[PDB]
RNA sequence: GUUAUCCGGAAUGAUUGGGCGUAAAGCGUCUGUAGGUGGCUUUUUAAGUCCGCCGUCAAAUCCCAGGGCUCAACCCUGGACAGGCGGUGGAAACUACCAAGCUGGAGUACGGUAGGGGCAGAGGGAAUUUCCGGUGGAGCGGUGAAAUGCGUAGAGAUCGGAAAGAACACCAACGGCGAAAGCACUCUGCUGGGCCGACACUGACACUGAGAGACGAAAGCUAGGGGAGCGAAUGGGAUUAGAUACCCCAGUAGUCCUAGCCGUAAACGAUGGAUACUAGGCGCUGUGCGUAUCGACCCGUGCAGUGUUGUAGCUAACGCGUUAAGUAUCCC
């Protein structure tokens, strides 16, 4: 999925020395995904740079039974910050571009998200990576506690 | 001898040493690096009659009116 | 060291960040109490008493590193609430609970201090001492 | 649909929820009053805090559950979470209070030791300028190149005299003390801090600080002195289209001292203060210990400060990195 496409440029004797970028986001909407960047001189090439890059990136983000987040968190990537809450099953993915994407392809179903400080699409991406790589999912802490799952349920 | 440490020996120690320093701020008045030291000490002492106010209202008025110190500035 | 319990807490927190499993903390009733209960709760290996000059020390071993010094997925947060400048206090039906409650909330309340799961249980409100995930 | 109004989005006045090295932003630096926060142990009390019960916070509205207008809006019945205030019965961890204790925080004594800390009083030599002589006898001085200027009324050069003021070569070092401003030829005297080692002692006496106070480069000002060098202003000589500039030749305030005022600087680490806690490597200053010899090293170490690289972590990057711009707490 091609989030962003952008017209960057290197300057030279000559003039503009014009070149794409692509900030693509890989997932098979089941609960793998990646995020990539691409840099060419056709939008295609670039595209196809970024999935490339992407798909030697990736990672998986915890579900929950009804298709949302273990728990709430939140992430920091340069200046972009972002917040992920679980939802109630039934009220979709509500978030802005980056975050959206990216959660949308992961498979998310249901999901709060807002990403405060910056908006670059790019670093929002990153950090929405870095927030749900570090979700524990329950069987996990009660391995890490050494605690029975119903003790913590409770 | 006595207590070197108790609160009334360290305030007289101040007083002290203060009334002394006044003969020399008094002989060299272009001074400041030592009325700056002056100011610190007579800090100190300050400080301390006060805490002694609020542990035992006895042994400081007794104090104050021992050394002669002015009364305090609570009042 | 004007504030003691938010003091402990950061030594674990740095000394975690640090990949050291070996801690010196100094004692009191609070102290001891919360460690305690960090051992109940698991966060935490072992803990022991020292003694020198009068002094107490409490070390505290804890968690081996996550496969790895470098690959680490999961750290040991802790953050403090209640706090000198604004005191914290929630009755029962306020009483916080930590990410869906994978996290604990210490609790100190009048049958003395505790988890949230406790204060649930007994019914009971009070001070906030921190949070811990 | 357009306009007006209000909240939102706006984390854009931020308790939840931001910042202040370079982006707007740390008072120039301290001392300190109110005010805020403040180590450990036992007891007391119960103001906060918590739990139960009661009174009330009108009805309507919002929320839940039914019912009525054919539905809905709307109307009607019943009931309640919040949240507040007041009475009463309990709990006692934490804040607060009360009584007694404890040193590791803060101090005091004692003994050490380094230092351009500060104020005052003595003394020193170079160099420069002028003046008085002797020699000598045409140029000195200056610039990119010149000229103004000084010189036969004897300049500069050189030797011998006096006199005056100001500044302190080498040491000097990516070294020392200071709150900062700053402080260095030498010496003496009056005095401020610092740091270190010992239990010798007191026992939380702490940290910060609105107002307020003291100090505070240089220029500047009032009054009296002083006046070599330098030198705003000013004048001449150039250079230039011009040159109210740069360069040269002169040269007044001022620079210096005493007694005051002024209170501003890129007063810069462009980094408020205190405390705790988190790799190292290589250095220095002070001391202490053990070793080396029995006195200088030497080594390893303990502190206290100071400098350079750099891990974690932080940051928009640069970078910062135990002297944080790291992880937290308190005040401005
Ligand atoms: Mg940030
Ligand atoms: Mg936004
Ligand atoms: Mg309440
Ligand atoms: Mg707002
Ligand atoms: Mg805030
Ligand atoms: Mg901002
Ligand atoms: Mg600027
Ligand atoms: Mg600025
Ligand atoms: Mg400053
Ligand atoms: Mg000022
Ligand atoms: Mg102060
Ligand atoms: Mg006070
Ligand atoms: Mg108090
Ligand atoms: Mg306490
Ligand atoms: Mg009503
Ligand atoms: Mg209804
Ligand atoms: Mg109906
Ligand atoms: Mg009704
Ligand atoms: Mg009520
Ligand atoms: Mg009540
Ligand atoms: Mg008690
Ligand atoms: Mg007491
Ligand atoms: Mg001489
Ligand atoms: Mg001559
Ligand atoms: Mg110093
Ligand atoms: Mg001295
Ligand atoms: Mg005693
Ligand atoms: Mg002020
Ligand atoms: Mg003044
Ligand atoms: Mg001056
Ligand atoms: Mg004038
Ligand atoms: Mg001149
Ligand atoms: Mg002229
Ligand atoms: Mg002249
Ligand atoms: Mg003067
Ligand atoms: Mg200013
Ligand atoms: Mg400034
Ligand atoms: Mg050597
Ligand atoms: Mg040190
Ligand atoms: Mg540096
Ligand atoms: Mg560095
Ligand atoms: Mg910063």
Redesign the pocket.
Known sequence: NVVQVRRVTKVVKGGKHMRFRAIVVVGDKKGQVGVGVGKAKEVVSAVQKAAVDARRNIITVPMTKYLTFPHRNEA?Y??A?VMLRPAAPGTGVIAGGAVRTVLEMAGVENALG?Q?GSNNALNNARATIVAVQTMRQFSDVARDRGIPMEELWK | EE?????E??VF??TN?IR??TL?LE???????????????L??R???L??LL??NGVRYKELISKLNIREL??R | ????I??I???I???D????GTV?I?S???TENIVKILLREGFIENARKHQE?????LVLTLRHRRNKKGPYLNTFHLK?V??????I??????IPRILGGMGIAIL??????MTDREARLE?????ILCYIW
């Open positions: 920091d340069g200046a910050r807002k405060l | 207590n070197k440490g108790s609160v020996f360290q120690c101040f040493k002394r320093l020399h002989l060299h008045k272009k001074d400041y690096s030592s009325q700056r030291g002056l100011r610190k000490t800090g100190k300050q400080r301390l006060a805490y609020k542990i500035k609570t | 060291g004007k504030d003691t938010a003091d807490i950061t030594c927190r740095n000394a960040m640090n990949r050291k010196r100094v009191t009733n609070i000059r009068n002094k107490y020390f403090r209640s706090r000198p400048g604004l005191r206090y929630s009755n029962y039906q306020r100190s309340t009048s049958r003395g201090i019914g009971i409100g009070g001070e």
